[PDB]
């Protein structure tokens, strides 16, 4: 009586980023990355869902969401990489760290993790020209750790 119809990306991400989680839910996290490739609508939906979660005022929700993003960048391939490397997504991270937007009430832990991940991708995936541009802009505008 196990359900054949695929679990939704919404159901999956809500479990992977649930503020009640006592520790990282790796099964749900790995499951979400594994499933977002399953259709055309998948990877853009996944990035929209992640962007919302990352903007949470509840620190543990946002930190879990960033851990999903980190993990999916490792396990997933091109369609997901292409969605993350658009300003459609990158702008949502910018809004989290910028004082113009949400930055003044975002947790330092969340802001620092965003800067780490962006920096990591500049070195690990140098082809992604818009990730490089966004990161260069954040430095130019004086967005730094702590």
């Amino acid at each position: 009586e196990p359900a054949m119809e695929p679990e939704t990306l919404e159901a999956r991400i809500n479990r992977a980023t649930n503020p009640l989680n006592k520790e990282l839910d790796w099964a749900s996290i790995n499951g979400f990355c594994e499933q977002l490739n399953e259709d055309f609508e998948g990877p853009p939906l996944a990035t929209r869902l992640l962007a919302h979660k990352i903007q949470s005022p509840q620190e543990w929700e946002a930190i879990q969401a960033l851990t999903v993003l980190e993990t999916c960048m490792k396990s997933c391939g091109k369609r997901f990489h292409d969605e993350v490397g658009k300003f459609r997504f990158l702008n949502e991270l910018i809004k989290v760290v910028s004082p113009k937007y949400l930055g003044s009430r975002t947790s330092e832990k969340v802001k620092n993790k965003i800067l780490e991940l962006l920096y990591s991708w500049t070195v690990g995936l140098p082809e992604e020209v818009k990730i490089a541009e966004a990161y260069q802009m954040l430095k130019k505008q004086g967005i730094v750790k702590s």
């Binding site: 658009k86 300003f87 990158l90 702008n91 910018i94 004082p99 937007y101 818009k130 802009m137 505008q141």
Partner: peptide, 11 residues
Amino acid sequence: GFSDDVPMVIA
């Protein structure tokens, strides 16, 4: 032709 993206938001 046309971008499927949007302009970068400035921090």
